[PDB]
Amino acid sequence: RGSHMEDFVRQCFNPMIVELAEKAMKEYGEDPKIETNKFAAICTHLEVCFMYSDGGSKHRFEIIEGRDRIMAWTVVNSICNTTGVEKPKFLPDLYDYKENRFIEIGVTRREVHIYYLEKANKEKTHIHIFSFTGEEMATKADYTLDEESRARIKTRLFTIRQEMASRSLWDSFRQSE
Ligand SMILES: C[C@H](C[C@@H](C[C@H](C[C@@H](CCN1CCCC1=O)N1CCCC1=O)N1CCCC1=O)N1CCCC1=O)N1CCCC1=O
Numbered sequence: 001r002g003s004h005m006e007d008f009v010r011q012c013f014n015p016m017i018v019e020l021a022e023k024a025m026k027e028y029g030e031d032p033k034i035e036t037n038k039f040a041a042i043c044t045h046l047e048v049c050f051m052y053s054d055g056g057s058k059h060r061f062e063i064i065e066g067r068d069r070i071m072a073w074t075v076v077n078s079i080c081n082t083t084g085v086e087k088p089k090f091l092p093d094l095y096d097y098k099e100n101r102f103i104e105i106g107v108t109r110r111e112v113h114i115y116y117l118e119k120a121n122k123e124k125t126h127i128h129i130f131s132f133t134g135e136e137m138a139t140k141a142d143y144t145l146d147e148e149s150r151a152r153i154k155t156r157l158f159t160i161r162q163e164m165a166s167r168s169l170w171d172s173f174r175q176s177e
């Protein structure tokens, strides 16, 4: 079957991001043309990660999300043996060289509180959550980045939810997380 979600995801997100998302979904055994809300979510999580890496220095962040499983773990191993940090139990999204810590990025359609707390159970790796309605929540209220960088990310999330709304896809997306 041919989605409206799939076609919208394709002409909304950047072709490289769509491809990286199709690769990750297929690696975990899922179909972008079947579970299309997950398709949109993966693209969003990716793009937010990339803007995050963009705000800041020239190369302050090492990008872990996007890479293939094996290579991502390789890079975190090299970081851990370089900075002396505990090899996380689960793959993070980035590493801050300035603050010497792995960052887990979060993008949720629930309360920033419940998604944080649920993710917080999954220990020195920073957590940072964003939301489609413009809210964010981060560990020790250390939001790592400039106010403008985070503002731009929030604006993007909101325009995405607007673009889904006018296509009547927003509600189906929301009642799925
Ligand atoms: C470096 C490239 C691709 C890079 C993805 C993005 C490009 C995006 C990000 C900007 N943004 C922000 C808004 C949404 C978006 O896409 N783009 C698109 C427009 C121009 C640009 O830079 N990055 C980030 C770092 C520099 C870069 O190239 N990856 C993929 C995962 C790891 C990684 O580093 N690698 C790495 C090895 C294989 C490969 O191919």
Ligand SMILES: Nc1ncnc2c1ncn2CCNC(=O)c1nc(-c2ccccc2C(F)(F)F)[nH]c(=O)c1O
Pocket: 028, 038, 041, 042, 045, 065, 091, 092, 093, 104, 105, 106, 107
């Ligand atoms: N069963 C699986 N489904 C998708 N991905 C799987 C995966 N198993 C392994 N991975 C890859 C490792 N995942 C991450 O690193 C990571 N996962 C998420 C997340 C988690 C659950 C449901 C949806 C999401 C997402 F937000 F992407 F859509 N959010 C993040 O921010 C993040 O960094």
